[PDB]
Amino acid sequence: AEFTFEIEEHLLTLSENEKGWTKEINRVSFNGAPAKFDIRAWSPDHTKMGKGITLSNEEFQTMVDAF
């Protein structure tokens, strides 16, 4: 379909708000591509995805070697 996604692995929860939504760092596949680092808000059951950013392994490593 116009886009598909899958949380392959959960790495870290950064926070949660009053409504149960969580901000998370996961490994997520989009449109059947190899999973990538993904930072974004998720609903309690993870069926709605909020604003966020997807990072390639190279970028993510850059960020971590950066800071």
Next chain:
Amino acid sequence: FTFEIEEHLLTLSENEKGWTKEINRVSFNGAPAKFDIRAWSPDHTKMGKGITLSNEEFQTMVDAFK
């Protein structure tokens, strides 16, 4: 809404259209700046999809991988 990039911290990549994916400190609606990762047009007058992280959220993350 209003917004200002108060500090440019890092560029993660750029595309053929000249747009960049960056980590900045960005103020929204007059609020204290927060960490912000998203795609910016070349002149930074248009942004793409991204997220904003509180100071405690960004620090939570950096600790976990290093």
